[PDB]
Design a protein around this nucleic acid. Structure first.
Ligand SMILES: [Mg+2]
Ligand SMILES: [Mg+2]
Ligand SMILES: [Mg+2]
Ligand SMILES: [Mg+2]
Ligand SMILES: [Mg+2]
Ligand SMILES: [Mg+2]
Ligand SMILES: [Mg+2]
Ligand SMILES: [Mg+2]
Ligand SMILES: [Mg+2]
Ligand SMILES: [Mg+2]
Ligand SMILES: [Mg+2]
Ligand SMILES: [Mg+2]
Ligand SMILES: [Mg+2]
Ligand SMILES: [Mg+2]
Ligand SMILES: [Mg+2]
Ligand SMILES: [Mg+2]
Ligand SMILES: [Mg+2]
Ligand SMILES: [Mg+2]
Ligand SMILES: [Mg+2]
Ligand SMILES: [Mg+2]
Ligand SMILES: [Mg+2]
Ligand SMILES: [Zn+2]
Lengths: 8, 94, 38, 129, 140, 134, 136
RNA sequence: GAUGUCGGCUCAUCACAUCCUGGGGCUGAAGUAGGUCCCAAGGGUAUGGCUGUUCGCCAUUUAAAGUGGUACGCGAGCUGG
RNA sequence: AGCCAGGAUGUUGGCUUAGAAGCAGCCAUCAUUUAAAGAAAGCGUAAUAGCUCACUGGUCGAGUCGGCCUGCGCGGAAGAU
């Protein structure tokens, strides 16, 4: 959960 | 080799020795051998400077009283408990 | 300025000066080093 | 370490022995010459048989007393570098002339040949020999 | 693994070995073995040292040379660890590994340090374990 | 007055010297061929300190310097790693015979006219790197 | 927390700290911290001085603690009246007389020993001095 | 052979270990806004909901809603929860 | 004491580290020129760089520095009529 690139 | 000038004590006791220390002098004793133990008073500052040398205690020293040289070694030393002072020193002849 | 009972030089530049009966440490290099006994 | 009186005496002895062996002594000022250059100066000195030693002026006067280089006592003003030539009297002057050309801050104050004090203009003549 | 025992987060990088067991002729069933496996998993996780993992991002920042000390210091202020530094004809590239929790509004602080002349890119790299203070914070 | 170290043969690629010559504003190709000339004559793959005194009006003067004593002694000992503890542990041993050739190589750098004094400067470096000296 | 492992009696009379000290010489090592005054050293104060002194020398050399807290001090609970027996033991203290050597050190340079004893002294309520061994 | 005991109200007075306003040093003080000390007592320094409450919490302000001493100031001034 | 000048070379010692170049740390603390220069006492740098210091040659002219013991002072030191 934490930025436009998706990811945690 | 340390030549230490000293005078025979006029009197002896806690009061006499405490008064001597208040005068910047300290009681000391020369004992051993046939000669009777002689009570002497030494200047505190003079001996305090000499005894800073480690060799002083081990090497023989000369003490002159009434112009007579006596060769002795420092048997025991009494130091003030907290202050950098010498309460008393014991000397053994030869 | 640090107002503390124990004032002392924290660097060579620090200087102990008594002004008007008050011990002060002034430092040319650091402002934080400035101190006053009080 | 403030040199001890004996330490200065050993210096005075060494310098006096070097001065007794030296055909020429050149006094110059190394004020403002960097170590990078000074080390190159000495490297050139060693190659040319010139022992270059900077000494305290007072020690130099103490050593000069009793050698043919008595005239140098006045020459000892400011920082004084003494370049004793052991092998060739002209080599020391030639090295200083090259250094002085490379370094406009290098002032060669005075020179001495055979007892006679030499002026700065005649130092160039000592280099031509 | 879908719901971790401690904090409910997904279990990762963990393997198990089934070496022994028991059965009944009538009672034993697929569902029964699944529930027994669940009980054993919880007991083992409770005794194994369970640590939460924080996602780490590979971050590359292009900064003017004058502010490189400031950007490197900001990344160090974050629990991020520098892994690289490339000087470039235009700007200086800085590579660092920073937890995403620390990477919030990083652009605002980065622009304040470099006069808005610095840009950064990031990619998820791995799940290194969180520091204890941050991990306890996550558990709460 | 710019100081940089470029390995022999690494002059040809633009990127290692690209930031240094881009910020100053110097053409890489001209420096490249010139530095390559000397580096190709010297053993390739050996790091070379270069003092490149660039004047403002596009004038470049580079001073090639002998490879550092660290790499020379490390290669002479044939070890790619130094010593973590110079005294309590020894990484490798070097020969006195091997101190003379590198001393002759770097004699142009120091100021002691004594070759034995130069072999001492290297053996002292060997003590710092933990190399045993006979 | 230095404290007798066992004792004959658990409570002791308050007593009087009078007289000069015994153990005034640096016997165990080269340097020592010597009390110039009289007072009581708590186990906690001794532990804090030991922690600060051992941290300074970077765990080098050897540290001798020449003083042991063998005296049980009893304090009454707050808001209780006088009497109703003696108070429960709370802490242990060592009686100090002027001249006592509290700590000794060896294997470290003298200039380093001076600083380590300065950091230890700060945590101590008794004026202390730096002493070195002497040949009697 | 009696010094009325909590809170409120009316009326205060002082201290300063200063809440605001005034002056200043350092700041991890760009500015705005702070933090922390030093100096300073001239003046100012809420209204209500709940509860007997002091207090506290809450709503809404305000430059700010100081902390204490005064027989926990004040019942031959009032009240009596 | 001040002032002038140098304060280096091997070298950016090895290790480590994203980097660690005298100056985070860790170990070694050597050798050269030599007036003297620490594998560095500081400031500084992301590392560099840069600025000092130790040390040294000049200038200058007479005392100067650091501890020990001790007398009497100073700061620490804010309350309510
Ligand atoms: Mg009596
Ligand atoms: Mg004033
Ligand atoms: Mg009555
Ligand atoms: Mg005030
Ligand atoms: Mg006021
Ligand atoms: Mg007032
Ligand atoms: Mg007025
Ligand atoms: Mg109501
Ligand atoms: Mg009041
Ligand atoms: Mg009031
Ligand atoms: Mg009261
Ligand atoms: Mg009342
Ligand atoms: Mg009344
Ligand atoms: Mg009345
Ligand atoms: Mg009435
Ligand atoms: Mg190094
Ligand atoms: Mg290092
Ligand atoms: Mg550094
Ligand atoms: Mg003169
Ligand atoms: Mg004179
Ligand atoms: Mg006083
Ligand atoms: Zn300062």
């Amino acid at each position: 959960x934490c930025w436009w690139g998706x990811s945690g | 080799m340390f030549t230490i000038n000293a005078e025979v004590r006029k009197e002896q006791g806690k009061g006499a020795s405490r008064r001597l220390r208040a005068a910047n002098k300290f009681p000391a004793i020369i004992y051993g051998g046939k000669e009777a133990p002689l009570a002497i008073e030494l200047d505190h500052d003079k001996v305090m400077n000499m005894q800073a040398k480690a060799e002083f205690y081990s090497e023989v020293l000369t003490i002159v009283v009434d112009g007579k040289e006596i060769k002795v070694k420092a048997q025991d030393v009494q130091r003030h408990p907290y202050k950098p002072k010498l309460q008393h020193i014991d000397f053994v002849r030869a | 300025m640090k107002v503390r009972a124990s004032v002392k030089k924290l660097c060579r530049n620090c200087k102990i000066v008594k002004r008007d009966g008050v011990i002060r440490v002034i430092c040319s290099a650091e402002p934080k080093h400035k101190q006053r006994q009080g | 370490m403030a040199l001890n009186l004996q330490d200065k005496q050993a210096i005075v002895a060494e310098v006096s022995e070097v001065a007794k062996g030296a055909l020429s002594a050149v006094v110059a000022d190394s004020r403002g010459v960097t170590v990078d250059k000074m080390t190159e100066l000495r490297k050139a000195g060693r190659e040319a048989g010139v022992y270059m030693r900077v000494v305290r002026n007072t020690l130099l006067r103490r050593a000069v007393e009793g050698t043919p280089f008595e005239c140098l006592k006045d020459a000892f003003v400011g920082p004084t570098l003494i370049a004793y030539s052991m092998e060739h009297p002209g080599a020391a002057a030639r090295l200083f002339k090259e250094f002085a050309k490379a370094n406009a801050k290098f002032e060669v104050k005075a020179a001495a040949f055979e007892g006679e004090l030499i002026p700065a203009s005649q130092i160039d003549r000592l280099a031509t020999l | 693994l879908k719901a971790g025992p401690l904090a409910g987060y997904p279990v990762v990088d963990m393997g198990i070995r089934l070496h022994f067991g028991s059965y009944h002729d009538v009672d034993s069933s697929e569902l029964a073995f699944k529930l027994a496996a669940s009980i054993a998993f919880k007991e083992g996780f409770k005794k194994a040292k369970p640590v939460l993992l924080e996602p780490i991002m590979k971050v590359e920042v292009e900064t003017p040379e004058e502010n490189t000390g400031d950007v490197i210091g900001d990344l160090s202020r974050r629990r991020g660890m520098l892994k690289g530094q490339e000087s470039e004809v235009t700007g200086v590239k800085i590579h660092a590994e920073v937890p995403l929790s620390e990477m919030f509004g990083y652009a605002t602080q980065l622009r304040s340090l470099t006069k808005g002349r610095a840009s950064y890119t990031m990619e998820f790299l791995k799940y290194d374990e969180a520091p204890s203070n941050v991990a306890q914070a996550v558990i709460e | 007055y710019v100081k940089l170290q470029v390995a022999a043969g690494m002059a040809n690629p633009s990127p290692p010297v690209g930031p240094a010559l881009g910020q100053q504003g110097v053409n890489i190709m001209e420096f490249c061929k010139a530095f390559n000339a000397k580096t190709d004559s010297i053993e390739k793959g050996l790091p070379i300190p270069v003092v490149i005194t660039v004047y403002a009006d596009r004038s470049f003067t580079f001073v090639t310097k002998t490879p550092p004593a660290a790499v020379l002694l490390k290669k002479a000992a044939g070890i790619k790693s130094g010593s973590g503890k110079p005294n309590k542990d020894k990484v490798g041993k070097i020969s006195r015979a091997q101190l003379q050739e590198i001393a002759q190589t770097k004699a142009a750098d120091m100021t002691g006219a004594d070759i034995e004094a130069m072999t001492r400067s290297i053996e002292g470096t060997a003590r710092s790197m933990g190399l045993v000296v006979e | 927390m230095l404290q007798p492992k066992r004792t004959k009696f658990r409570k002791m009379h308050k007593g009087r700290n009078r007289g000069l000290a015994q153990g005034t010489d640096v016997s165990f090592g080269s340097f020592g911290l010597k009390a110039v005054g009289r007072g009581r050293l708590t186990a906690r104060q001794i532990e804090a001085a030991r922690r600060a002194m051992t941290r300074a020398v970077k765990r080098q050399g050897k540290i001798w603690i020449r003083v042991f807290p063998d005296k049980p001090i009893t304090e009454k609970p707050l808001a209780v009246r006088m009497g109703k027996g003696k108070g429960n033991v709370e802490y242990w203290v060592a009686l100090i007389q002027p001249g006592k050597v509290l700590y000794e050190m060896d294997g470290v340079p003298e200039e380093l020993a001076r600083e380590a004893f300065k950091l230890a002294a700060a945590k101590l309520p008794i004026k202390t001095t730096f002493v070195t061994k002497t040949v009697m």
